[PDB]
Amino acid sequence: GSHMNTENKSQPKRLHVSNIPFRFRDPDLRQMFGQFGKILDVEIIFNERGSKGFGFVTFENSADADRAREKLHGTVVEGRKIEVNNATARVMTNKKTVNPYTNG
RNA sequence: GGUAGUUUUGGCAUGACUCUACC
């Protein structure tokens, strides 16, 4: 038995990226990662301080995601050697608290 | 109900609350 299966959870894959500049944004990220396959979404982590030093990227499927991972893992950008990984199970994401449109 | 910004406190280590808008 397992916590999930590849029957309904997902279609794309997702990639953690560490040690990136605090001065990168979602378009600065996808510019490097998109040379291996189509980006579908991007995420950056925020205490207050901007980027918590890492971000994530969403790729059209795993067989093009892992190409970026084996290539960009160890690349130094603005002097900082980045890591590239599979993402590992998000928080209870709930940026949908209230709006007039939600029911009436 | 569907999407984006306003801006960092500073290298934090696998995820985001919070603020301002649009719809």
Experimental technique used to determine this entry: NMR
The dihedral through the CA atoms of A7, A89, A70, A42 has a sign that is positive
For A28, A44, A47, A64, A98, the CA distances from A23, given in Å and listed in that order, are 9, 11, 15, 26, 31
Report the distance from CA of residue A10 to the C1' of nucleotide B15 in Å, as an integer. Answer: 17
A64 C-beta less than 7 Å away from strand B: no
Q: Which two tokens stand for residue A26?
A: 């979602």
Cα–Cα nearest to A54, from A64, A67, A45, A62: A45
At a CB cut-off of 8 Å and minimum separation 6, what does A22 contact? A49, A50, A51, A53
Report the distance from CA of residue A63 to the C1' of nucleotide B11 in Å, as an integer. Answer: 31
Domains belonging to chain A, first-starting first, are 1-104 (3.30.70.330)
A14 C-beta less than 7 Å away from strand B: yes
Contact A82, A76 (CB under 8 A): yes
Distance of CA A72 to the CA centre of its chain: 14
At a CB cut-off of 8 Å and minimum separation 6, what does A16 contact? A54, A55, A56, A83, A84, A85, A86, A87, A88
